[PDB]
Amino acid sequence: TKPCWYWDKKDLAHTPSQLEGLDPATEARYRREGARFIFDVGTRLGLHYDTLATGIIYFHRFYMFHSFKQFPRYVTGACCLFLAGKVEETPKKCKDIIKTARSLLNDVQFGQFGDDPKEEVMVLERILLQTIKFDLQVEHPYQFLLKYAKQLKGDKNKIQKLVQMAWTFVNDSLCTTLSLQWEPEIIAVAVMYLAGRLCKFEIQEWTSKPMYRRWWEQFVQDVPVDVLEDICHQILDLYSQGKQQMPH
Amino acid sequence: TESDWGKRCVDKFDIIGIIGEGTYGQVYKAKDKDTGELVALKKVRLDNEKEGFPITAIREIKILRQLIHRSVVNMKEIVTDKQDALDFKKDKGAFYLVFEYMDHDLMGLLESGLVHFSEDHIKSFMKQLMEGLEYCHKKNFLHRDIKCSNILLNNSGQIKLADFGLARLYNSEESRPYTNKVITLWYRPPELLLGEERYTPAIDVWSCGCILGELFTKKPIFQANLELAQLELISRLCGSPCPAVWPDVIRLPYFNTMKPKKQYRRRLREEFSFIPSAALDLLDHMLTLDPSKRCTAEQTLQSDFLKDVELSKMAPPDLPHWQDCH
Amino acid sequence: MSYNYVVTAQKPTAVNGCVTGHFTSAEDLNLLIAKNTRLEIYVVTAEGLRPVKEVGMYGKIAVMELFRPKGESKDLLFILTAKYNACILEYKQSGESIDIITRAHGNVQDRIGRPSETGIIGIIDPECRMIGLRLYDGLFKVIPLDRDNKELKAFNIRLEELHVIDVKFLYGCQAPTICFVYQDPQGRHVKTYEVSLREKEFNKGPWKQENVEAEASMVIAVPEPFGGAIIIGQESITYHNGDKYLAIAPPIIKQSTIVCHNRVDPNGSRYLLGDMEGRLFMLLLEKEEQMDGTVTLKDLRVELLGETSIAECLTYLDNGVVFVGSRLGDSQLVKLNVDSNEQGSYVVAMETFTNLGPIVDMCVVDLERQGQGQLVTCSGAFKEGSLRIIRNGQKLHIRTVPLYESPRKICYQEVSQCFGVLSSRIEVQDTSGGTTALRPSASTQALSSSVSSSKLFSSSTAPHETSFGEEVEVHNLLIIDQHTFEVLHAHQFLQNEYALSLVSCKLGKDPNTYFIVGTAMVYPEEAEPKQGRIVVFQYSDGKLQTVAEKEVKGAVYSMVEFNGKLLASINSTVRLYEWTTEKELRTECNHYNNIMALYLKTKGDFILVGDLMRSVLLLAYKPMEGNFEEIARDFNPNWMSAVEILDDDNFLGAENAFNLFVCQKDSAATTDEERQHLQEVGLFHLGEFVNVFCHGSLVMQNLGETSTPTQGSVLFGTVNGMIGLVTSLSESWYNLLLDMQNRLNKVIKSVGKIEHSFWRSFHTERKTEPATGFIDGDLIESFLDISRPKMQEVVANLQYDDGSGMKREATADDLIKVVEELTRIH
Ligand SMILES: CC[C@H](CO)Nc1nc(NCCCCCc2cccc3ccccc23)c2ncn(C(C)C)c2n1
């Protein structure tokens, strides 16, 4: 019926990129750069946050089936965003995506697009669709962050601080393979959990079950804290590796 | 696995003929060699590369893999032409969307004059359609192209909805800007004739009501070539758009521009007096001018006409067979 | 775009209605006979009919009635066309000048309505206060006959009874009253309502009765001496007036359905009744006068008079002369005698008026080698079945070959100097368990005969029950000689086997010329036949020899010879067979993308297929590959009745809605879709139902010289007997004639003031389109009959292009030459 789009962390040691001699750090770096390229390009073009995420999810899934050494990432990124735009009904012309890419990429990087940038991107659409197995509908942590936050009742300002902090964590998790490890519902809960821990908030009090200390189980059944803690640990890793710190 | 679409080749189908062409594109009737099942293949051409893969197809793929209902057509898989080896840039082969083969389409059945509908056949027909529309509307999807050519009927009497090329998501809380003209002129709702652009799911209900009437007359209710003449025909029957019956008609862009010859009174019940009482009520509520007063899909199912229709007793339409040949 | 020309060679011959009254003068008794689109006016004499006038109308005549409103000296004529064009007409004569006046006119079509099953019904009040029309289920339309209603404006009264069988205005009522039989789930009933012009609604009726026969068919409004109504059924005739109820159920009428009625005596004492087997009855009303001074109906009686042609309409005229207007056989004038003849009959034929009747099929063959052509048509039905040899000589010469059974398909086999005809005769289940024919017919009177002994279906295992009295069709193949039309041989097909297709041809390397018949096993239980045969016969030495049989899984609707191979359509499948050296058929290729492959035509390696609902498809045999290819299909949905190939790119079709269209291959190879899309380049409302398209012409063309502007010749036969012709034009010639039509339409006065452009507009219940690509030749040939002032008015500013001069003014005498050349094509 529908394809399975989630892998185990241990499996990422065996992506095509890894097996062609790319080391783990480099593929992770390529994923951040490709995702952030997609994010920056679409943000300049005024695209809805779902459209950016869909392209990023297409991108992340793509490089589970192909190697970064044979498919230049910024071309792939641009193609994903182009398709994402048509999928999410925020369409853009390919020539406009290319124009924005030239602004944000240096000459060496834009070298990936070859002699005819538009062609290299449009040609890839055939491969992208086959690669993502024509499963175009994608759900993102954002809708669950809001669906769940809406059922919280309490201090308006504390809950809005929780949401925005978690929302930032969602935007940051797009640079990682979490999109490939856990369903979005879990991500939304995980980022709420991390925002709560950092804000010294106790979310159970805002739920309809204030004495149910595992507050998330009434949103997402069957999630052990182990999963939530792993997701949080990985999100905070990005902040510690970089120079940026937790938003608070 | 069954889910790995886009890889299997169209070699797996024996093409029987070309069933259809037009805005939807080229559709071929085929039989799968391995299963022996009759299918319908829509050729999607990305060779133009003006916008790459058509958005009409992207919506139909996106929506019909999410919608599962007896009265919604099923896309079984997507298959491809023999592709060029190790030359993805050179390759221009087209993709084919596999559907189930529906024996007939309502337009073909009506235009050829070969069908007759009793009240009970119309009950079985409308119940399925409005149940299907209900499934889609409850999922916040608007068909936006309900016409007789897009309703498919098997000889079994099963009804399935089809061309989702123009379908888009609807936000129940927030108004979104949409394409001004979406439905065929004969089946276009009055709000879209006046250019609402923020249309509700009620646009699809109006279209089905035009079909409900058409099934009792065998002739479309409102046939016009120009948007003004269509509003005139609707007005002669349903009444002219009035601030009294349509409070927000003044907000519609072309309200002052597009005026009917007169401020007509509603004559729907009089001109359709030959329709059964239970159905005439359904027509009057589905052909309501005000989008907010127009009934929902669910409300039609909880009507005297369709509520107590047992869907097990399909009752197929009067198919012509040899009797009409002779 | 394509350009074609359509003309009538023989006008509609079938009688669709007949009334008598005082239309031409308040003094003469006239007989008005209606043929499709044609009105004939006669005056009744002591020897027969004197013709006085004939007009054409731009419409199929659906209702025809004579009425005389207070203040008029003579009867006026009401006519309603099948496209809902209404008008009131008057006869006016000024010495030698006869014309028809349009007194009132308008189109009464409703924007919304369901057309009724029993068709348009039109009746007029005895006081001529209003015209009643039953056009749509659930509605009664009233046109009030006031002096001011020159536009025939009308209103609708809601009618609760949705399914109405028949209605009449009753006699003797205080207000206008209707009597109608209706059918609802409880059976058919007879009811009365009253009609109020002031209130514009129905009021309670004089009497309400129910429980009339389940198959009650016709309503008779009995005149004032008796009052009330008579109801004719399948088994019983009943009279209803108020409380009075009389019913006669004589066994004689059960045998055959009664279809027509007419009043003999104006008091209502006697009526004529006719039935489908051609019998003519007298219905007699027996008067009983009470000492009160009142007359009441005592009893009903039915007496058999004799035999007539299977009659669509009857008219009593005067003396003992009755006019038998026939749609299936020859129309007639018969005299009723008081004394029976020695055979027991009171009916003696006077005159026989030719009716080409239903033309089921036809072939064009030059029998006498006159380099001209003759048309041998399969015409008539049941006891009226005939073969009509038609040759052009200024009138057409028609020889009739009575068959007394239904003809279905005809083909010519020159090698054998004979014709093959497929026939159907009706037999009835009798007490022996078998069946008995109602009369001898061609199949029973053949010199030599044979019966299929095939064992293909002999395995049966399928039980079918028989009830005494039920009809069954027996299909035969008839071998008929071309010099003497004596039926030489009759081959009877299997029980429940229908012969659907016949071809005469040689196949493969086989030098013998065969008759090949395609059949279908027809059982009442089956919606679509699932068994069938292709049978190869040889006619040799006065005997038909069965050569080979091929079983198929369906009905062989159509067959055609194809480059020595046999092309046959079995239900959805289109198949090509080869003829082996072992004298057996072997399949080569198949096409399955059809609903029902009703019609087939070929040219070279191209095949045109006609479908029940999917218009027309062009197939091609790829000899390199040994299979079929879909060249182009017409995607617009149409219900086909016949198809024909005009040339390699143009294809002609006929719709069941009485319309003609021409499809053209786009021949523009920019995209695959454009090639596969057949474009409906021609649209034309003919007004006739076309059963057969045949290439050929009846014109004397022994040597070719002076060929006309028209190129190509296709003849077509219709249900109403009309034989027509379709030919092609060059672009310039079409535009000249088209520009001229628009000029003639402004000049020529139409009966009923019906717009010619409206009449020829393509029309189904769901669409109306302006005609395109077709020249109404019958309009063009009317230029010769219009007065000189009108001719010169037509030719003003007329310029023909593409000629020696880019623009050349035409004179009237120039055109009279052009139209005369066009008249020679038929
Ligand atoms: C044209 C667009 C529509 C989209 O709805 N064609 C369509 N007709 C589906 N059945 C109907 C089959 C009807 C009969 C088929 C046929 C056979 C031979 C000749 C014909 C000539 C004219 C018309 C029909 C003909 C159907 N079943 C699934 N699909 C998907 C591709 C949506 C379908 N599309």
Author numbering:
A (entry chain C): 20 to 267
B (entry chain B): 715 to 1040
C (entry chain A): 1 to 393, 708 to 1140
Sentences from the paper on this structure:
Recently, several unexpectedly diverse compounds were reported to deplete cyclin K by linking CDK12–cyclin K to the DDB1–CUL4–RBX1 E3 ligase. Here, to investigate how chemically dissimilar small molecules trigger cyclin K degradation, we evaluated 91 candidate degraders in structural, biophysical and cellular studies and reveal all compounds acquire glue activity via simultaneous CDK12 binding and engagement of DDB1 interfacial residues, in particular Arg928. Crystallographic dissection of 28 ternary complexes demonstrated that despite considerable diversity of the molecular glues, the overall complex architecture is highly similar. The low-affinity DDB1–CDK12 interaction primes the complex, while the ligand, through filling the kinase pocket and bridging over to DDB1, drives robust association, offering a rationale for the unusually broad chemical diversity observed.
Further modifications of an otherwise robust recruiter DS11, including extension, shortening or rigidification of the alkyl chain, or introduction of larger π-systems all negatively impacted activity, underscoring the importance of correct arene positioning and identifying steric constraints for bulky compounds that lack conformational plasticity (see also Supplementary Note for a more detailed discussion of the underlying SAR). In summary, exploration of CR8 SAR around the R1 position demonstrated that surprisingly diverse gluing moieties (arenes and heteroarenes of varying size, but also aliphatic groups—albeit weakly) can engage the Arg928 side chain and therefore facilitate DDB1–CDK12 interactions.
